[PDB]
Amino acid sequence: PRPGLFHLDSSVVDLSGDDFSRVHRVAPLCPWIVLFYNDGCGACRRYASTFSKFAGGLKVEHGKDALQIATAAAVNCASEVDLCRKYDINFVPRLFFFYPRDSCRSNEECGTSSLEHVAFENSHLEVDELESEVRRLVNKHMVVDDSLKERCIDMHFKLYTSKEELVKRSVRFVETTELYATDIAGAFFSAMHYDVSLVGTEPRERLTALEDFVLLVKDSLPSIGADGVVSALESITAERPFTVASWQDAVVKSGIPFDGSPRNVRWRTCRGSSPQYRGFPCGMWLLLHALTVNTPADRNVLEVIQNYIRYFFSCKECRDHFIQFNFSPNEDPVLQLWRAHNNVNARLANVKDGADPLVPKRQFPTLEACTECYDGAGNFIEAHVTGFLKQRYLWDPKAVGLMESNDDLN
Numbered sequence: 001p002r003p004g005l006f007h008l009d010s011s012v013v014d015l016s017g018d019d020f021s022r023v024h025r026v027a028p029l030c031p032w033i034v035l036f037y038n039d040g041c042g043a044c045r046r047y048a049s050t051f052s053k054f055a056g057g058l059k060v061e062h063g064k065d066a067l068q069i070a071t072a073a074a075v076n077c078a079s080e081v082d083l084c085r086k087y088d089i090n091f092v093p094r095l096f097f098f099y100p101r102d103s104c105r106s107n108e109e110c111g112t113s114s115l116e117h118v119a120f121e122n123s124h125l126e127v128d129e130l131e132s133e134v135r136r137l138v139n140k141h142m143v144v145d146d147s148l149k150e151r152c153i154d155m156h157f158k159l160y161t162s163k164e165e166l167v168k169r170s171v172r173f174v175e176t177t178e179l180y181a182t183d184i185a186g187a188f189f190s191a192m193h194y195d196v197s198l199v200g201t202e203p204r205e206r207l208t209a210l211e212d213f214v215l216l217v218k219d220s221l222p223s224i225g226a227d228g229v230v231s232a233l234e235s236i237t238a239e240r241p242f243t244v245a246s247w248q249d250a251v252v253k254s255g256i257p258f259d260g261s262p263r264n265v266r267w268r269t270c271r272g273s274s275p276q277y278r279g280f281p282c283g284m285w286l287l288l289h290a291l292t293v294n295t296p297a298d299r300n301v302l303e304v305i306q307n308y309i310r311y312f313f314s315c316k317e318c319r320d321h322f323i324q325f326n327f328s329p330n331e332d333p334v335l336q337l338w339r340a341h342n343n344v345n346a347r348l349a350n351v352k353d354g355a356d357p358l359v360p361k362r363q364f365p366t367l368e369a370c371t372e373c374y375d376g377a378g379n380f381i382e383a384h385v386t387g388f389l390k391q392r393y394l395w396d397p398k399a400v401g402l403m404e405s406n407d408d409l410n
C-alpha cells in the first residue's frame with residue numbers, strides 16, 4: 001500500500017487501472033490527462049508539483065472553457081506495475097491523454113465507447129502549456145454539448161470532494177434516519193442544477209413536464225427557493241432561449257436552502273457509508289413524498305411527478321421502471337407513492353454491487369419507527385401509515401430557514 005505523490009491532493013485521481021468505469025460511471029464519457037510516474041523518482045517528485053497546480057485549475061464550478069471537462073489523474077508505477085508495462089512506461093514522468101472514441105450528445109443515451117489515448121510528445125509542460133495542450137486535445141478529439149460538459153464537471157467534483165474527505169479524515173457509521181428538510185432542498189437543487197441541464201427544455205412535452213413540476217414545488221413547498229426557478233422558467237423565449245449557463249445561474253441565485261455548495265451537496269438523511277452511495281436518488285424520493293403530502297388542491301401530483309421523472313430523471317433504469325407504475329385516481333397519492341417506493345425497496349433488497357452495505361433496503365416504515373401502522377400482528381396496517389407519512393413529510397417552511405451551527409464546517 002503505497003501513498004504515492006498525490007495522496008494528499010484531492011485534485012488528482014489516483015488510478016490503479018485502465019477501466020474508467022471503476023473510477024465513476026460517467027468517467028468513460030470524459031477526457032483524462034494522466035501522469036504516469038514513480039513515487040521514488042526525483043524528476044517525478046519535482047514535476048508532481050506542476051501537475052498538481054494544473055489539476056487545481058480544473059476546479060471551476062461552472063466552466064465556459066472546454067478545458068473544464070478534463071480531469072487530472074496519475075498512475076504510480078511503483079504500485080501499478082502491470083499497468084505501466086501495458087502502456088510501455090519505462091522512463092517517467094509520461095503524460096497520456098485519454099478520451100472516448102465518440103462523444104455523447106445531449107439527448108442521446110451515452111453508451112460504452114472505445115477508450116482512446118494519445119501519448120504527449122513532451123511530458124515536461126508548464127501549467128500554461130498543459131492547459132493549452134489539454135484544451136487543444138479536447139477540442140480536436142471531442143464534440144462537447146453543454147450537457148456533456150455538465151456531465152463531466154459533476155463527475156470530477158464528486159471525486160474531488162470524496163477524496164478531500166479521505167484526506168481530511170487523514171488528520172463507526174450510523175445511518176441518519178430522521179428526515180431533514182435540507183435533503184429535500186438538496187434534491188430540488190440537484191434536480192434543477194443537474195437533471196434539467198442534461199436534457200434541456202425541448203420538446204414542448206418536456207418543457208410542460210418541467211413547468212408543472214416546478215409550479216407544484218413552489219405551491220407545495222413554500223420557501224424552498226422554487227420562486228426564482230419559476231421566474232427563470234418564465235424567462236425563456238424564442239428570443240432568449242434556454243442555455244445551461246443561464247439556467248444554472250438562476251438556479252444558484254434562487255436561494256434554495258440546501259446545505260453544502262453547488263458542487264458539493266450535503267446530505268444528512270441521505271448520507272451513505274461512502275459518498276458514492278445514496279445521496280441524490282434518496283433525496284428525490286424524499287422530495288416526491290413531501291409533494292404528495294404537501295400538495296394543494298386537486299393538483300395532479302402523481303401525474304406531475306411521473307411526467308417529470310419521465311422527461312428528467314438522470315437514472316435510466318429508474319426512469320424506465322417508474323413509468324410502468326399505473327397510478328389510480330381513486331386512492332390517496334400518499335399511499336400509492338408509498339407502495340411504489342416499498343415495491344422498489346423489495347426489488348433492491350438483495351443487490352450487492354452498487355449498494356450501500358451499511359444501509360439495507362427494508363419495507364417502510366419499520367416496526368420500530370411505526371408500531372401503530374405496523375400492527376395487526378403479522379401484517380401491515382395501511383390506516384395509520386397515512387397519518388405517519390402525512391406527519392413525517394409535512395412541510396414546515398420555518399424548519400429549513402433557521403440558524404445552522406458553524407462547526408458544521410466539519
Ligand SMILES: Cc1cc2nc3c(=O)[nH]c(=O)nc-3n(C[C@H](O)[C@H](O)[C@H](O)COP(=O)(O)OP(=O)(O)OC[C@H]3O[C@@H](n4cnc5c(N)ncnc54)[C@H](O)[C@@H]3O)c2cc1C
Nearest residue numbers: 278281282284285289317318321322338341342344359364
Ligand atoms: C423514482 C425513482 C425510481 C428509482 N428506480 C430505481 C431503479 O429502478 N433501480 C435502482 O437500482 N434504483 C432506483 N432508484 C434509486 C433507489 O430506489 C434508491 O433511491 C437508492 O438505491 C438509494 O436508496 P436508499 O437506501 O438511500 O433509500 P431510498 O430508497 O432512496 O429512500 C430514501 C428515504 O426515503 C424514506 N423511505 C424509504 N421507503 C419509503 C417508503 N416506502 N415510503 C416513503 N418513504 C420511504 C427513507 O427515509 C429512506 O431513507 C429510484 C429512485 C427514484 C426516486
